[PDB]
């Protein structure tokens, strides 16, 4: 395997898409799936900061982040020059752009929006991680369709590697112009994105960055601007919560997610339209409850590693209506009240075994890193299509996703290609 890359071989570069944190940004494909993926490519001599062993023990954390509106990163790959972050690409572009072209947004709409990065920045911080700028250029549409999902781009790097070289100042909490970071300083963040969403203008407005970190330093903001006499007292009761000036007392990731204002919007529940949609999820996961345990880890990476937005689109609503806690996971309670609407909007009386033991059941084949929910790729691995997730080319990537030292044949350590596909077509 003397004259092969690890990223070369397996990804060709199509073109830049952007110069990113720390490195470009770059569209590939992959050489077996035809699959596109983002990648950002970052020079070691330059930007390493820490030892490789530290990078990849880092990035590995990242990988293992399993939610809706953050970004899911593949894998890192390395040869002698540069690091690969090879990732999802979205291509509806930033937020930011969506505020000039909107100006600014009704109060359902900025809800439906600002709950997801709630939910993002709850999942961030439960992992203890602060994002450190989050601002709307780092939060990136999925696609171009109407109510697609954000996802929260850009952080987990930041001691790793090293920048060298307009409108952060805008964002900052008045504690990081003391040096200091915290988790409460993304909710001020998130604070001034919301208060741009609902009036089109920043907070701590000015013409240069001296005068707006001005405004900053003194914690002052109002809601003088004329377009804010007809917004709720609910959207202004959360934006004075988020904008505390002491970190202390400003609420927490997850009582912005929880505040009556987010609750009352976005509410989006079950209907008659997402039956047959439903009955496809409960095959798939039916079986799944009782497939092999060989069977049901194998599917969890593929599915995990290799799905696409046009494919899992449709799992992607039915999972968002029965995440009533809008926190991006699925409990054990949402489940079980998922399966008795399900079965009152298709007309059949709940009151084999109950739906509650049911469930119970299913949760620990499901759950399948213990992590007490059902994150989005356990979710897709289980409620998918095998007729549509079995390609041969996904085979042929899964094959050579597992043969490490590149035999042809895999070893037990690991863990010929034709017994491959026949395992999987079970
Ligand atoms: C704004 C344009 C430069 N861009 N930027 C991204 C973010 C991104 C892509 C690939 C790897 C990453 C690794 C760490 C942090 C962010 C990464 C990105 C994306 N996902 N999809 C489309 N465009 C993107
Ligand atoms: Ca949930
Ligand atoms: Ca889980
Ligand atoms: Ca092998």
């Given at each position: 395997?003397?004259?092969?890359?690890?990223?070369?071989?397996?990804?060709?570069?199509?073109?830049?898409?952007?110069?990113?944190?720390?490195?470009?940004?770059?569209?590939?494909?992959?050489?077996?799936?035809?699959?596109?993926?983002?990648?950002?490519?970052?020079?070691?001599?330059?930007?390493?900061?820490?030892?490789?062993?530290?990078?990849?023990?880092?990035?590995?954390?990242?990988?293992?982040?399993?939610?809706?509106?953050?970004?899911?990163?593949?894998?890192?790959?390395?040869?002698?020059?540069?690091?690969?972050?090879?990732?999802?690409?979205?291509?509806?572009?930033?937020?930011?752009?969506?505020?000039?072209?909107?100006?600014?947004?009704?109060?359902?709409?900025?809800?439906?929006?600002?709950?997801?990065?709630?939910?993002?920045?709850?999942?961030?911080?439960?992992?203890?991680?602060?994002?450190?700028?989050?601002?709307?250029?780092?939060?990136?549409?999925?696609?171009?369709?109407?109510?697609?999902?954000?996802?929260?781009?850009?952080?987990?790097?930041?001691?790793?590697?090293?920048?060298?070289?307009?409108?952060?100042?805008?964002?900052?909490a008045?504690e990081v112009?003391?040096?200091?970071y915290d988790?409460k300083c993304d909710?001020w963040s998130?604070?001034?994105?919301?208060?741009?969403?609902?009036?089109?203008?920043?907070?701590?407005?000015?013409?240069?960055?001296?005068?707006?970190?001005?405004?900053?330093?003194?914690?002052?903001?109002?809601?003088?601007?004329?377009?804010?006499?007809?917004?709720?007292?609910?959207?202004?009761?959360?934006?004075?919560?988020?904008?505390?000036?002491?970190?202390?007392?400003?609420?927490?990731?997850?009582?912005?997610?929880?505040?009556?204002?987010?609750?009352?919007?976005?509410?989006?529940?079950?209907?008659?339209?997402?039956?047959?949609?439903?009955?496809?999820?409960?095959?798939?996961?039916?079986?799944?409850?009782?497939?092999?345990?060989?069977?049901?880890?194998?599917?969890?990476?593929?599915?995990?590693?290799?799905?696409?937005?046009?494919?899992?689109?449709?799992?992607?609503?039915?999972?968002?209506?029965?995440?009533?806690?809008?926190?991006?996971?699925?409990?054990?309670?949402?489940?079980?009240?998922?399966?008795?609407?399900?079965?009152?909007?298709?007309?059949?009386?709940?009151?084999?075994?109950?739906?509650?033991?049911?469930?119970?059941?299913?949760?620990?084949?499901?759950?399948?890193?213990?992590?007490?929910?059902?994150?989005?790729?356990?979710?897709?691995?289980?409620?998918?299509?095998?007729?549509?997730?079995?390609?041969?080319?996904?085979?042929?990537?899964?094959?050579?996703?597992?043969?490490?030292?590149?035999?042809?044949?895999?070893?037990?350590?690991?863990?010929?290609?034709?017994?491959?596909?026949?395992?999987?077509?079970?």
């Open positions: 395997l003397y004259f092969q890359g690890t990223f070369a071989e397996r990804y060709n570069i199509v073109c830049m898409l952007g110069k990113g944190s720390f490195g470009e940004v770059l569209k590939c494909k992959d050489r077996i799936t035809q699959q596109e993926y983002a990648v950002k490519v970052i020079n070691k001599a330059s930007a390493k900061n820490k030892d490789t062993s530290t990078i990849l023990r880092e990035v590995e954390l990242l990988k293992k982040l399993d939610h809706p509106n953050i970004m899911k990163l593949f894998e890192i790959l390395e040869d002698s020059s540069s690091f690969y972050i090879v990732g999802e690409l979205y291509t509806g572009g930033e937020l930011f752009d969506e505020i000039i072209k909107r100006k600014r947004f009704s109060e359902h709409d900025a809800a439906r929006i600002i709950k997801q990065v709630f939910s993002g920045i709850t999942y961030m911080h439960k992992h203890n991680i602060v994002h450190r700028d989050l601002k709307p250029e780092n939060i990136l549409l999925e696609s171009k369709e109407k109510d697609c999902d954000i996802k929260i781009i850009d952080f987990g790097l930041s001691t790793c590697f090293q920048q060298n070289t307009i409108g952060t100042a805008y964002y900052i008045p112009l003391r040096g200091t988790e909710v998130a604070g001034v994105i919301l208060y741009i969403l609902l009036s089109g203008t920043p907070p701590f407005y000015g013409k240069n960055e001296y005068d707006i970190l001005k405004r900053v330093e003194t914690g002052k903001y109002a809601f003088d601007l004329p377009q804010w006499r007809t917004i709720s007292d609910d959207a202004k009761d959360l934006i004075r919560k988020m904008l505390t000036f002491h970190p202390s007392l400003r609420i927490t990731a997850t009582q912005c997610l929880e505040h009556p204002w987010i609750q009352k919007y976005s509410s989006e529940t079950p209907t008659i339209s997402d039956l047959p949609s439903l009955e496809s999820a409960m095959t798939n996961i039916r079986q799944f409850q009782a497939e092999k345990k060989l069977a049901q880890a194998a599917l969890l990476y593929m599915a995990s590693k290799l799905t696409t937005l046009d494919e899992t689109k449709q799992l992607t609503e039915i999972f968002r209506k029965l995440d009533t806690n809008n926190d991006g996971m699925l409990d054990r309670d949402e489940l079980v009240r998922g399966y008795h609407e399900f079965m009152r909007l298709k007309g059949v009386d709940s009151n084999g075994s109950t739906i509650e033991d049911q469930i119970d059941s299913l949760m620990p084949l499901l759950d399948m890193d213990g992590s007490g929910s059902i994150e989005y790729s356990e979710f897709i691995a289980s409620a998918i299509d095998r007729t549509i997730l079995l390609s041969r080319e996904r085979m042929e990537r899964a094959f050579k996703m597992f043969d490490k030292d590149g035999s042809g044949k895999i070893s037990t350590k690991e863990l010929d290609f034709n017994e491959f596909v026949e395992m999987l077509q079970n």
